Amino acid sequence: AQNPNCNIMIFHPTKEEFNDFDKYIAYMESQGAHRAGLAKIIPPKEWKARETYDNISEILIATPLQQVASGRAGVFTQYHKKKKAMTVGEYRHLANSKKYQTPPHQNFEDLERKYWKNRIYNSPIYGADISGSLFDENTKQWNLGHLGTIQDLLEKECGVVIEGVNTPYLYFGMWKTTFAWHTEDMDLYSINYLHLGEPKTWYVVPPEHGQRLERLARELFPGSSRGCGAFLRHKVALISPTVLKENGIPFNRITQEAGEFMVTFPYGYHAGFNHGFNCAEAINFATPRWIDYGKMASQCSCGEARVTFSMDAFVRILQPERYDLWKRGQD
Numbered sequence: 001a002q003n004p005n006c007n008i009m010i011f012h013p014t015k016e017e018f019n020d021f022d023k024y025i026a027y028m029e030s031q032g033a034h035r036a037g038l039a040k041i042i043p044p045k046e047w048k049a050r051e052t053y054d055n056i057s058e059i060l061i062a063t064p065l066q067q068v069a070s071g072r073a074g075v076f077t078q079y080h081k082k083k084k085a086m087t088v089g090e091y092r093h094l095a096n097s098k099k100y101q102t103p104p105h106q107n108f109e110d111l112e113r114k115y116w117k118n119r120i121y122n123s124p125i126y127g128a129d130i131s132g133s134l135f136d137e138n139t140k141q142w143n144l145g146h147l148g149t150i151q152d153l154l155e156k157e158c159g160v161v162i163e164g165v166n167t168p169y170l171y172f173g174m175w176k177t178t179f180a181w182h183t184e185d186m187d188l189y190s191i192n193y194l195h196l197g198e199p200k201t202w203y204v205v206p207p208e209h210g211q212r213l214e215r216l217a218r219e220l221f222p223g224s225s226r227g228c229g230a231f232l233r234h235k236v237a238l239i240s241p242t243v244l245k246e247n248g249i250p251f252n253r254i255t256q257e258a259g260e261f262m263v264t265f266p267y268g269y270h271a272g273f274n275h276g277f278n279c280a281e282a283i284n285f286a287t288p289r290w291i292d293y294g295k296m297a298s299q300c301s302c303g304e305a306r307v308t309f310s311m312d313a314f315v316r317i318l319q320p321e322r323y324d325l326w327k328r329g330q331d
């Protein structure tokens, strides 16, 4: 078995290997990359996502989210307070202000220490989940707006034609902006490209051990667990590496820098934080190997997780028993 300790693997495809996206994902899995839940892909040196980032300041962040924490430093939830609209140029200036800017630090490890010590005492503002793309239309390789769609994959594998669309999302971050522990909708893959700015640190639990993280989360968030049998779908809970180590949960960590891709694999729980002002683009995707994970994915039916239009068909076709209850949650 390849990669039996479930380490995060880093790949350096050549420009020739960067042509065929599906083939390269299947290659990475042949080497065991999926066992970690997360992989890094460094693009060939010839490749670029677009020519420059000099003209992005007028993108609108219609609903910036202030991430307010509750709990203790290593075990907390966050809620998202909606703020007034602002442009990316306005948000960049805010991220760089004395109130929000990255503190002085020695290296990524010192910054990580500072994040876990101090995150809860601040409420950073995240421009998350903005439909759109920063890939030039002429970028032919690993263009996250030109991937094969999940609906087309389901149709190719299973023969059923379904409604729905699959488009990318932009994320504008600042110091301490946080992504809570989650797997993707329907335990899909994700791919995330860091277009510009400061790094993003990731934590990940191997898919084969995801239920260990879930059992810890039920212990640590006991009211949330009684409220919903899949409350991590709410994407609000944080657990630090120190707490994971104290409870024996297998995980790994890695820092993504500008110009790098990350792939999350089906049922790979992940969480993390931004180091400073940045912009990432991400989208979900599927392969043949995903289908079985989609059939088994948990679902939130309490009403909190409220998701996209396109998830309807995935539930309806892959999980017809759960369909009725899940749809009641969505309505």
Ligand SMILES: O=C(O)CNC(=O)C(=O)O
Residues within 6 Å of the ligand: 171, 178, 179, 190, 191, 192, 200, 264, 270, 280, 282, 283
């Ligand atoms: O970058 C972020 O805030 C969160 N991204 C992801 O969870 C992802 O790409 O799957």
Ligand SMILES: [Mg+2]
Residues within 6 Å of the ligand: 055, 056, 057, 058, 059
């Ligand atoms: Mg602009």
Ligand code: NI
Residues within 6 Å of the ligand: 182, 183, 184, 190, 264, 270
């Ligand atoms: Ni994710």
Ligand SMILES: [Zn+2]
Residues within 6 Å of the ligand: 227, 228, 229, 230, 231, 233, 234, 300, 301, 302, 303, 304, 305
């Ligand atoms: Zn729920």
